[model samples]
Target: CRYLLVRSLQTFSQAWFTCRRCYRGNLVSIHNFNINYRIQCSVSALNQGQVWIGGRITGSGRCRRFQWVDGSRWNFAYWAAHQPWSRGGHCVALCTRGGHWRRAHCLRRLPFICSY
Candidate 1:
């Protein structure tokens, strides 16, 4: 079994490829603000290091909402700075310089880290 571990500064597609080829899963995110808040709010929440597997958005066009697979919905958004701009189709979030989240096309090339 392989697990994918990517740094905060990786593009979505790059992470996707690493997971698919190296980790054998779809793209997994690890930086959702709402999910982290919920985990901290949980009384039985174990300090599982850091939040992994962020969330996936639904709907189409400029009205997508991000939802986590572990049943967490992002009500509060904490973009790095200027983020999540409408990028036409299938927008992916990537960590930019200075720890900022930026939305970019899924076809962009960026370095990614993976784990098995």
Candidate 2:
């Protein structure tokens, strides 16, 4: 399976727009961890957009909850150790290290991941 992760100072609308522009589709939220969205895009497309996979704090926001459109119910998230501390409303989900979650500022630059 392939996965794509993006962290940047983008509101929900901007983030979704970026994902759509790059992947030619809407961003998808996977319940594997914190409120994280995986972009479905070809590797080539991702490269053209100059987006990479890394941990970047894009903005200060906390996603206290999440749900999928497939009619999946939202439940307690399986957060990584020492994560989602709720600092200034900055929340991030790290897929590295077998996928983990972290809280950070949104403007902080970090690497994001894209897979094919």
State TM-scores per candidate: 0.46, 0.43
Off by over 4 Å in 1: 1-17, 31-57, 67-77, 86-89, 113-116
Report the C-alpha lDDT of model 1 over 3-116, residue by residue, as the tens digit. 333544445545555566765655433454553334334312332222223334566665676664334444555555545654423444434222334444545444443323
Angstrom error at residue 5, model 1: 6.0
lDDT of prediction 2: 0.42
Give per-residue lDDT, candidate 1, residue 91: 43
lDDT of 1: 0.43
RMSD of each: 8.6, 8.0
Inter-residue clash pairs, candidate 1: 29-54
